[PDB]
Amino acid sequence: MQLFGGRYDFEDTEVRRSNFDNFPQALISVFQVLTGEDWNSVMYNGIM
């Protein structure tokens, strides 16, 4: 929530729903990266 809260302020019309805006959402995102599923997308967004 620090490093990536806000920060997905891209001007694209696509959705990046696994983001780190709230606390419920951040928690869901952290868990998804533990199940391993699609964590590369959550990392690519943190680099862009």
Partner 1 sequence: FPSAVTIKSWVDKMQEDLVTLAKTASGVHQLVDIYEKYQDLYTVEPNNARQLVEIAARDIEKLLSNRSKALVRLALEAEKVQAAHQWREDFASNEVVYYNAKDDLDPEKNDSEPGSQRIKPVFIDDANFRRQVSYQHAAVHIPTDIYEGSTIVLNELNWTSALDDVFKKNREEDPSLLWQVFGSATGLARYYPASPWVDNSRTPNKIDLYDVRRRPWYIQGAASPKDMLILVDVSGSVSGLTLKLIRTSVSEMLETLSDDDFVNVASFNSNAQDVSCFQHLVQANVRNKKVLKDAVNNITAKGITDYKKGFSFAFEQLLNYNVSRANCNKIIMLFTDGGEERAQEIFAKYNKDKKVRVFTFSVGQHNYDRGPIQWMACENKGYYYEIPSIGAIRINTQEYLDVLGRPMVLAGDKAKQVQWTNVYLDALELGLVITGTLPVFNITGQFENKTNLKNQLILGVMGVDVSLEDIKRLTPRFTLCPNGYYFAIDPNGYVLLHPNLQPKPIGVGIPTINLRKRRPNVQNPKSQEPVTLDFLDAELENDIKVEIRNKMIDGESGEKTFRTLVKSQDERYIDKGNRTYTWTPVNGTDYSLALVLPTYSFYYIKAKIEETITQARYSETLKPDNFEESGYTFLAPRDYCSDLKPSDNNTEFLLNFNEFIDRKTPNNPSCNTDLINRVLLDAGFTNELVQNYWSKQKNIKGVKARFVVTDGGITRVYPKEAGENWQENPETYEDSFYKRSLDNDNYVFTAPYFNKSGPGAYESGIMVSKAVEIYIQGKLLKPAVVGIKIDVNSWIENFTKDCKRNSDVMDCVILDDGGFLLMANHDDYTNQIGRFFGEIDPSLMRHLVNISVYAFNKSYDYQSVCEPGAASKQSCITEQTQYFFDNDSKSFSGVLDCGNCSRIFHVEKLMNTNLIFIMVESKGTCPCDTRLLIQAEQTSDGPDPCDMVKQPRYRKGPDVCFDNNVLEDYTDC
Q: Is 6 in the site for partner 1 (CB under 8 A)?
A: yes
Dihedral in degrees, nearest 10, Cα atoms 24, 26, 32, 36? -160
Of partner 1, Ca ion, none, which one does residue 4 interact with (CB within 5 to 8 Å by kind)?
A: none
Is 14 labelled a binding residue? Answer: no
Tokens for 4?
């990536």
Of Ca ion, partner 1, none, which one does residue 22 interact with (CB within 5 to 8 Å by kind)?
A: partner 1
Q: Are 9 and 16 in contact (CB under 8 A)?
A: no
Site for Ca ion in 11-30 (CB under 5 A): none
Extract the annotated binding site: 37
